[PDB]
Design a protein around this ligand. Structure first.
Ligand code: MG
Ligand code: MG
Ligand code: MG
Lengths: 115, 262, 261, 263, 113, 118
């Protein structure tokens, strides 16, 4: 499996890379740039990021995949467990939704579900 | 040559297949070919006095239509060429308005959507009187994602089906919707299984072919009541072009990424 | 004598029962309705009555089956556009009067206890409130003989549903049950068989306690969403021109419906 | 002083908190003049600075949003036969709510934050905004029929943007109250959030439309030339409203008096 | 502390039998509720002049305006689903038939507080 | 049972008449003629061919629906065609057709469905 993780915080990128082939990038705009060049099995993204957020990226990715781009499942991570935010993401195209800080065992099992 | 035209003169059914020589978007060539054929077919139908002809808008691509020529947009915006962008926008309006008023020959316009329809593509489907969609097809208006809005009649056509307020939301949210969802929202008229769209169109044609006087009369009633005036749509694209000209580098880069994907 | 009129002057409630003596809008029935509308409206205006109630009902086992098709067939075959236009215009005046409350800001209530087809359904839609009993069927079958509903179907439905859905309903020629129409928003209340009168009485009693509010709302309608008479008149102009162009297949269909009525 | 104004000039977000000096939460003459006065002031500042797609939020400092018209004032003017002053009040209420509808003449995004009950004019004021955020447990409705009047501050005009003309009529004449969840299903409210989460929900809406300011402003221009409610139309509706109010009897006036005391 | 309102003068006294104040009319119970506080109000649906539904609608707005909440139970000879429809959406918690069943009246009143 | 049959081809009318006599039958050439027959006499069930020139089976169903709501006696209609597409089956079912059977008709399936009616 080939992974692509995106988070604005420095501490979050490092802990996820150690427990998991992984590429890490900062913003939501950059993960859209990274996906345009390379192909990935799954994308892990933080919901609340400055500038462009997880949902804005999700909507933009949805139109890209509908335009012809190869499908990649997206799992979202967030501190907010609010039911209104979960519904909006899966209606934008999200396949999984996990709370922060995420338990390692449940992340790996949900990644195994996608394949 | 961007179109594949199938004509059935003895039955007065006419099929327009987009993207015959294949980005599956409304390029200048595709727009000119559509308007050129609309004008041609409409004049032939009028002089022959054909009552309630049927025109079908379909696609030869695996998508229906992905909307405006974004690569052209990026270029004209960066060059500051308002005149050419307005020209393009006005020609897109003429194309979709012609479907809305039945080519000036009181035709029944049917959109056959067997692949994804985005932006201008969705607007073109909405310009037809009947929308047939196949299961798994996605439609939406993603132009807000690069800080623009749908100016090819999205608002005008949706207001025929839903409230002005809900139409506004849909235009500004930038979500995609499945055929089943759009059916529930009243934005699509029929959803059929994959590869059954043609048969569904044939049933619609056969249904309205038996009531040609009723259809033609209803178009006259539309003309004098709820029909969207061409002028209204032209003024909407004026706003569209002025907005597009003010777009920044972040929007232009978003458009560039979509161009590469599309 | 096509109408049975029940007047309650001290309560200002007025009942119009169609078909007192084919249960369709004949010339006699139309003239009797418009004649009574004009009469009652003038009496209500001069007496300064606030928010009177007018009920459109039927003495037949159906509500109303629509236009006088036997008359249509004859005028179309004879090429008499002038008389067909005259009929169509008088039908418009009848249904528009219900829509604007007889020019006296009345509350118009349609009591539909039997089937309402074509013009019959249009007459129900011209009222402000539609009460239907279970098992009642309504629809617009004029497309089945290549015509369209020109007595305000489009104008009245556009008050309740979208312009696009209104178009579909007018061109499909399906019949709908009361329960279906309720879900579609084309009917306001569905009650069990033989309970319609009581349901109308509840509506009357409800709006009788807010007569100033009702009358003010009619004024607001007048200056906003109310259907202008002129608009409907121009729609029947298109209707007559279409009817005059009808072929023998349509005329035979109309003849078969005449015999079934 | 009936308003508490919070301005964020560098972000162009402006908060209007009603009932700042409640230490009856209705549209009093003072409150209406303060709103229109601020709308005119802020709108002129936004136009001259050429601000693109500013955000204006209508909120409340009371435990209710707004209970509607000043009924105590209504009772007095009706009993005195003062049509001129009642018309003046009604016209000023129209200007307040229409300004929200057209974005203060500066193409602003108007957001109603409803964290307490909104009745009559209060509900009409929420409906005048482009987006309505409501908290759970909040009740809204149009109770003016209960004293034989109707909502004349744009209820009909604003609801017709969201629902059918026929359903709008029913709601205006039934006099029922509806919960936030019910209004959401009816399409009369845009978002329902848990208690004490309204501000965060408004911030998400602001942040969402802040990234598409050109698209928002262009859409206002499109509204202006199509579906926007003309001021003149609303003015003529309040003319009918005042004439109706002047004809009200003692039973209606007593009903109004009882509501005044409960307020 | 009960407050009962009915148009029939015979129905008023028979409910008083099984800390209860009776009043005649729907406007009079509203005037009583402003005078002093009550625990629950039992009202007849079909009263001339002003009915139970109008009182419920009027109380609903008053309670939303700032008045103390008091639960309401409705009595009527009518039992149709279209009559309960309007009452339960106006603020009523319990619905009962006429003449009232003594067992269902007392039990439902205890469930409130 | 009293049966009314409509098919535009002579052979089809003949095979249907023969098999269901082993009921009383009247065979007619099209959709308009069965409607004319139903006004003159009453029938227990109508068997109609879907595809006929001029007026087809689906029109007849839609015309009968309004006629039956206008005061005409109700009578069951079963449709026959070599067209067995769900597209065509949906149309007839929506128009009030009680049964849709494939052509060439299976005698066992026709008679059992007719027995279910009355
Ligand atoms: Mg974060
Ligand atoms: Mg009683
Ligand atoms: Mg055949």
């Amino acid at each position: 499996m080939r992974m692509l993780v995106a988070d604005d915080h420095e501490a979050n990128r490092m802990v996820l890379q150690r427990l998991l082939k992984v590429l890490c990038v900062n913003g939501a705009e950059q993960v859209l740039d990274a996906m345009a060049e390379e192909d990935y099995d799954a994308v892990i993204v933080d919901l609340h990021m400055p500038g462009m957020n997880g949902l804005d990226m999700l909507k933009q990715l949805r139109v890209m995949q509908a335009s012809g781009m190869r499908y990649t499942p997206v799992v979202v991570l967030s501190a907010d467990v609010t039911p209104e935010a979960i519904r909006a993401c899966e209606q934008a195209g999200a396949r999984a939704f996990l709370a922060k800080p995420v338990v390692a065992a449940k992340l790996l099992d949900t990644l195994a579900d996608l394949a | 040559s961007t179109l594949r035209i199938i004509e059935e003169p003895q039955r007065d059914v006419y099929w327009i297949h987009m993207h015959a020589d294949l980005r599956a978007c409304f390029s200048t060539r595709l727009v000119d070919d559509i308007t050129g054929y609309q004008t041609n077919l409409g004049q032939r139908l009028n002089t022959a006095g054909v009552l309630a002809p049927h025109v079908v808008l379909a696609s030869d691509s695996d998508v229906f239509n992905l909307g405006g020529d974004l690569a052209l947009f990026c270029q004209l915006i960066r060059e500051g060429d308002r005149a050419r962008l307005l020209d393009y926008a006005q020609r897109c309006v003429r194309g979709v308005h012609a479907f809305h008023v039945g080519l000036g020959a009181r035709a029944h316009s049917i959109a056959l959507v067997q692949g994804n329809a985005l932006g201008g593509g969705f607007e073109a489907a909405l310009s037809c009187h009947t929308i047939i969609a196949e299961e798994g097809v996605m439609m939406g208006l993603p132009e807000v994602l690069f800080d623009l809005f749908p100016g090819m009649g999205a608002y005008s056509f949706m207001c025929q089906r839903i409230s002005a307020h809900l139409a506004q939301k849909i235009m500004l949210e930038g979500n995609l919707y499945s055929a089943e969802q759009l059916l529930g929202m009243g934005l699509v008229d029929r959803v059929v299984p994959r590869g059954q769209g043609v048969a569904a169109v044939e049933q619609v044609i056969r249904e309205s072919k038996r009531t040609p006087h009723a259809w033609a009369a209803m178009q006259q009633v539309r003309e004098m009541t709820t029909a969207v005036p061409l002028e209204e749509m032209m003024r909407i694209t004026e706003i569209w072009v002025d907005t597009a000209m003010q777009l920044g580098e972040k929007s232009l880069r978003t458009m560039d990424r979509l161009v590469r994907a599309q």
